[PDB]
Amino acid sequence: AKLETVTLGNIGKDGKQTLVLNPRGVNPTNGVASLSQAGAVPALEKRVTVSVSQPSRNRKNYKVQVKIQNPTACTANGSCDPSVTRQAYADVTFSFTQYSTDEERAFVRTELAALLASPLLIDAIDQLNPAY
Amino acid sequence: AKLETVTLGNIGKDGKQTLVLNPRGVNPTNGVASLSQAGAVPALEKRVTVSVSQPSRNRKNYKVQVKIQNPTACSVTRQAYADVTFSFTQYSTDEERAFVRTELAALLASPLLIDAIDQLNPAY
Amino acid sequence: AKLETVTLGNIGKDGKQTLVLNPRGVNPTNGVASLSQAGAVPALEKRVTVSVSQPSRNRKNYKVQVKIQNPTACTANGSCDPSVTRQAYADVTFSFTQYSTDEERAFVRTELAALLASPLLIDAIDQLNPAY
Amino acid sequence: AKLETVTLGNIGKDGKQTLVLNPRGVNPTNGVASLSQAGAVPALEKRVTVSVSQPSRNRKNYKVQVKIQNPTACTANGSCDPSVTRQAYADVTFSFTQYSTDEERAFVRTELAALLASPLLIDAIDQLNPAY
Amino acid sequence: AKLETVTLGNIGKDGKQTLVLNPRGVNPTNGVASLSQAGAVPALEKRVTVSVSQPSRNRKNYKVQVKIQNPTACTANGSCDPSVTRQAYADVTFSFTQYSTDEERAFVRTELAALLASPLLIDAIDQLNPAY
Amino acid sequence: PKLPRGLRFGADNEILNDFQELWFPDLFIESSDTHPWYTLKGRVLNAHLDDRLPNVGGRQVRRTPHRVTVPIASSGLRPVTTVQYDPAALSFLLNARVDWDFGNGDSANLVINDFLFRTFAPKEFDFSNSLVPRYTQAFSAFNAKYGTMIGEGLETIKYLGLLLRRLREGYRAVKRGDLRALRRVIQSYHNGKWKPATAGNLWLEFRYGLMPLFYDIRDVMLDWQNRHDKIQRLLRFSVGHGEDYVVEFDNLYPAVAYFKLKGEITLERRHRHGISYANREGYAVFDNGSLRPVSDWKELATAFINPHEVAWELTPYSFVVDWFLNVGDILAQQGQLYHNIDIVDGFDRRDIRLKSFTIKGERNGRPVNVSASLSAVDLFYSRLHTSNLPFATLDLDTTFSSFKHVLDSIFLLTQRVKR
RNA sequence: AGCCGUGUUCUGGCACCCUACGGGGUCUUCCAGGGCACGAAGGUUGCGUCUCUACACGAGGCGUAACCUGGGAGGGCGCCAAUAUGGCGCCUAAUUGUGAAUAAAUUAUCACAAUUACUCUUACGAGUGAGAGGGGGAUCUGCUUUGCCCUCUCUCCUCCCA
CB contact under 8 A, E1 and F140: no
Q: Which residues contact A126 (CB under 8 A, 6 or more apart)?
A: A13
Helix boundaries (H) for chain D:
102-117, 119-126
SS (H, E, C) chain F: CCCCCCEEECCCCCEEECHHHHHCCCCEEECCCCCCCEEEEEEECCCEECCEECCCCCCCEEECCCCCCCCCCCCCCCCCCCEEECCCCCEEEECCCCEEEECCCEEEEEEEECCCCCCCCCCCCCCHHHHCHHHHHHHHHHHHHHHHHHHHHHHHHHHHHHHHHHHHHHHHHHHHCCCCHHHHCHHHCCCCCCCCCCCCCCCHHHHCCCHHHHHHHHHHHHHHHHHHHHHHHCCEEEEEEEEEEEECCCCECCCCCCCCEEEEEEEEEEEEEEEEEEECCCCCCCCCCCCCCCHHHHHHHHHCCCCCCCHHHCCHHHHHHHHHHHHHHHHHHHHHHHCCEEEEEEEEEEEEEEEEEEEEECCCCCCCECCCCEEEEECCEEEEECCCCCCCCCCCCCCCHHHHHHHHHHHHHHHCCCC
Please tell me whether any atom of strand G lies within 7 Å of the Cβ of F91: no
Closest CA to B82 of B106, B108, B101: B108
Q: Do chains F and A touch (3 or more CB pairs under 8 A)?
A: yes
Instruction: Determine how many CB atoms are found less than 10 A away from the CB of residue F323.
Output: 19
Handedness of CA A34, A40, A42, A44 (dihedral sign): negative
Distances (CA, A) of F133 to C53, F114, F140, F273, F390: 68, 45, 12, 12, 11
Residues 6+ apart with CB under 8 A from F320: F171
Which residues in 158-217 of chain F line strand G, with CB less than 7 A from it? 181, 191-193
With CB atoms and an 8 Å threshold, state whether A99 touches F290: no
Contacts of B91 in chain A (CB under 8 A): 41-43, 80-81
| Beta pairing partners, A94 | A64
> How far is it, in rounded angstroms, from Cα F342 to Cα F354?
37
* HEC readout, A87-118: EEEEEEEEEECCCCCHHHHHHHHHHHHHHCCC
Phi, psi of B54 (to 5 degrees): -75, 170
**If one looks up domain B1-123 in CATH, what number appears?**
3.30.380.10
DSSP β-bridge partners for residue F360: F262
**Rg, Å, chain F Cα set:** 33
Cβ neighbors of A105 (< 8 A, separation 6 or more) are A94, A96
Cα(D98)–Cα(E87) distance, integer angstroms: 15
CA distance A39 to A45: 7
Q: What is the DSSP letter of E42?
A: G
Contact F386, F308 (CB under 8 A): no
**Contact yes or no for A41/A51 (Cβ under 8 A):** no
User: Which nucleotide lies closest to F289 by the C1' atom and the CA atom?
Assistant: G140
CB F165 within 8 A of CB F409: no
The reply to whether omega before D40 is within 30° of 0 (cis) is: yes
Q: How far apart are CA F10 and CA F290, in angstroms?
A: 14
What is the maximum alpha-carbon separation in chain A? 58
Cis peptide before D77 (omega within 30 of 0): no
Q: Are A69 and A46 in contact (CB under 8 A)?
A: yes
Nucleotides on chain G within 7 angstroms of protein Cβ = 5-6, 28, 31, 49-53, 74-77, 82-86, 118, 123, 125-126, 130-131, 133-149
Strand order in the sheet with C6-11: C6-11, C17-27, C32-36, C47-52, C64-69, C89-93
Collect all residues from E whose CB is shorter than 8 A from any CB in D: 25, 27-29, 40-43, 81, 83
Q: Assign A32 to helix, strand or coil.
A: strand
- Which among A53, A99, A100 is the top mutation candidate for probing chain F, defined by the most F β-carbons within 10 Å of its own β-carbon? A99
Across the interface, of E28, E41, E43, the residue whose CB is closest to D26 is E28
Residues in chain A: 132
Closest of F124, F140, F82 to residue F271, by C-alpha: F124
Do D104 and E81 form a contact (C-beta atoms < 8 A)? no
Euclidean distance between CA atoms F101 and F363, whole angstroms? 13
Q: Is residue B122 helix, strand or coil? A: coil
- C103 by DSSP, 3-state: which? helix
Distance of CA C122 to the CA centre of its chain: 16
Nearest 5°: CA angle at E65, between E64 and E69? Answer: 160
Helix (H, G, I), strand (E, B) or coil at D61: strand
Peptide bond between residue F173 and the one before it cis (omega within 30 degrees of 0): no
**Across D12-126, where does the E strand assignment appear?**
17-23, 33-37, 47-53, 61-74, 83-97
C21 close to C48: Cβ distance less than 8 angstroms: yes
**Residue B93 parent element (H or E):** none
Residue A20 CA to residue A37 CA, distance in Å, equals 5
CA–C1' nearest nucleotide, residue F240: G129
How many Å lie between the alpha carbon of F337 and the closest alpha carbon of chain D? 18
Residue F275, CB-side half-sphere exposure with 13 Å CA sphere: 22
- Specify the length of chain D in residues: 132
Tell me which chain E residue has its CA closest to the CA of residue F141.
Answer: E56
Spatial CB neighbours of F131, under 8 Å, sequence gap ≥ 6: F239, F240, F241, F271, F272, F273
Query: Cβ(F132)–Cβ(F390) under 8 Å?
Result: yes
Provide the residue count of chain F.
419
By Cβ distance, the residue of C28, C45, C47 closest to F204 is: C28
Give the residues across from C70 on adjacent strands. Answer: none
Best CA proximity match to B44, nearest among B24, B28, B27: B24
Q: Residue F344 in contact with residue F287, Cβ under 8 Å?
A: no
What backbone phi and psi angles, to 5 degrees, belong to D52?
Answer: -130, 105
For residue F174, count CB atoms less than 10 angstroms from its CB and return exposed for 0-12, middle for 13-18, buried for 19 or more: middle
3-state secondary structure of B71: strand
| Separation between Cα atoms, residue F169 and residue F157, nearest integer Å | 18
Quote the CA–CA distance of F146 and F234 in Å, as a whole number.
Answer: 9
From residue A78, give the alpha-carbon distance in Å to each of A39, A43, A86, B95: 19, 18, 19, 18
Q: What distance in Å separates the CA atoms of residue E8 and residue F235, rounded to the nearest whole number?
A: 43
Q: Which of A1, A109, A113 is nearest to A51 (CA)?
A: A1
- Residue F139 phi, psi dihedral angles, 5° rounding: -60, -45
Q: What three-state secondary structure class fits C122?
A: helix
Nucleotide nearest to A60 (CA to C1'): G140
Yes or no: say if F60 and F121 are a contact pair by the CB < 8 Å rule: no
Residue B25's contacts (CB-CB under 8 Å, 6 or more residues apart) are B34
Cβ < 7 Å from strand G, C residues 29-88: 59-61, 63
Nearest Cβ partner of A57 from F2, F13, F293?
F293
CA distances from A79 to A24, A76, A83, C128 (A): 30, 7, 11, 59
Alpha-carbon separation of residue F78 from F11, F286, F335 (angstroms): 21, 11, 18
Q: Is the CB of F66 under 7 A from strand G?
A: yes
CA of B28: nearest nucleotide by C1' is G142
Amino acid at site C96: F
Any F CB within 8 A of C36 CB: yes
CATH 3.90.1170.50 fits E1-131, yes or no: no
Q: Which nucleotide is nearest to F78 (CA to C1')?
A: G148
Domain boundary assignment for chain B: 1-123
Q: How many CB pairs under 8 A join A and F?
A: 17
CA dist., res. C43 & res. C72, Å (int):
6
Of F136, F343, F389, the CB nearest to D28: F136
Distance between first and last Cα of chain C: 44
Please state, as a whole number, how many other Cβ atoms lie within 10 Å of the Cβ of residue F21: 19
Q: What are the CA-CA distances from residue E62 to residues E3, E93, E95, E113, F402 (Å)?
A: 21, 10, 5, 20, 35
Complete DSSP assignment for D101-119: -HHHHHHHHHHHHHHHHSH
Question: Measured in angstroms, what separates residue C63's CA from nucleotide G56's C1'?
Answer: 23
Instruction: Check if the beta carbon of residue B37 is closer than 8 Å to that of residue B21.
Output: yes
Map residue B96 onto helix, strand or coil.
helix
Taking the C-alpha atoms of residue F7 and residue F14, their distance in angstroms, rounded to an integer, is: 10
User: How far does the CA of residue D4 sit from the closest CA of chain E (Å)?
Assistant: 15
One-letter amino acid for residue F417 of the chain: V
SS3 state at B106? helix
Assess contact for F54 and F36: CB atoms under 8 A.
yes
**How far is Cα A17 from Cα B83, in angstroms, rounded to an integer?**
45
Q: Which of A56, A57, A60, A97 has the highest number of chain F CBs within 10 A, making it the mutation to test binding with F?
A: A57
Instruction: Please report the resolution in angstroms.
Output: 4.6
Q: In sequence order, what are the residues at sequence separation of 6 or more whose Cβ sits closer than 8 angstroms to the Cβ of residue F63?
A: F27, F28, F30, F83, F84, F85, F86
H or E segment and range at residue A62: strand A62-71
Phi, psi (rounded to 5 degrees) for A127: -100, 5
Residue type present at position D123: D
Q: Give the C-alpha separation, C80 to D39, whole Å.
A: 54
E52 vs F134: CA distance, rounded Å: 10
For residue A65, the cross-strand partners are: A51, A93
Per the CB < 8 A criterion, the answer to whether F73 and F340 are in contact is no
CA pair distance D126, A76, nearest whole angstrom:
103
Residue E89 has φ and ψ, to the nearest 5°, of: -120, 145
How far F249 CA lies from chain E's nearest CA (Å)?
Answer: 27
Please, are residues D76 and D83 in contact by the beta-carbon 8 Å criterion? Answer: yes
How crowded is residue F277: how many other Cβ atoms within 10 Å of its Cβ? 22
DSSP at D6:
E
Least Cα distance to F317 among F190, F191, F203 occurs for: F203
Of B30, B90, B95, the CB nearest to A29: B30
Nearest Cα residue to A46 out of A6, A100, A105: A6
Task: Report how far apart, in Å, the C-alpha atoms of F371 and of each of F40, F62, F94, F99, F180 are.
Answer: 16, 34, 11, 10, 91
F335/F74 Cα distance (integer angstroms): 9
3-class secondary-structure state, position E25: strand
Gap between the Cα atoms of F406 and F412, Å rounded: 10
Contact E28 F136 (CB under 8 A): yes
3-class SS of residue C22: strand
* Residues making up chain E, counted from first to last: 132
Tell if F327 CB is < 7 Å from nucleic strand G.
Answer: no
Residues of F with CB under 8 A from a CB of C: 200-201, 204-205, 207-209, 211, 307-310, 312-313
Query: Distance between CA atoms of B117 and D55, rounded to whole angstroms?
Result: 85
